[PDB]
Amino acid sequence: EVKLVESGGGLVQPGGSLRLSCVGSGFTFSSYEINWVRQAPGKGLEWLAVVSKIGDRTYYADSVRGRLTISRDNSQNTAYLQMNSLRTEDTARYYCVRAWCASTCLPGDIMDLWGPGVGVVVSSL
């Protein structure tokens, strides 16, 4: 029943911008935090970004600080990720994950339900 399906990703040239939109259904999206996590095809997971419950208090990762800007709209139950600049390293499957507080509160400790994943394939060709 509960889902975090997302879309808005595709093949883009390097040094470009992308708009990833993640929608949620049937789990009161305004009350739970949502994070964005990167998984490289062979280099394991990597946590990218956090937006809090209200929409403010955004804290990113060290490797993508400033490069990625996250946003949240609780009216239509959406979380947006802006990839303002993209190198060739950023080709990966991006997941929007629901994560509430167990020990570490705002970065999230229990990533309960993961989105199906959207594949960003940056390429100069």
Binding site: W100, C101, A102, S103, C105, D109, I110
Partner: protein, 49 residues
């Protein structure tokens, strides 16, 4: 008059094992003693951030 004198011996409970986190064990007088997980209430199935 008469008085009964007794010396009760030493009393000490047996050594037990500290429970693993998340384990809820049946206890005394019909009470389910819970050592719940992080982020949950005293009831192990109720979230508590």
């Amino acid at each position: 008059d008469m008085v009964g004198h007794h010396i009760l011996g030493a009393c000490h409970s047996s050594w037990q094992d500290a429970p693993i986190q998340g384990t809820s064990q049946m206890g005394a007088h019909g009470q389910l003693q819970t050592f719940p997980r992080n982020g949950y209430d005293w009831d192990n199935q109720t979230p508590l951030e």
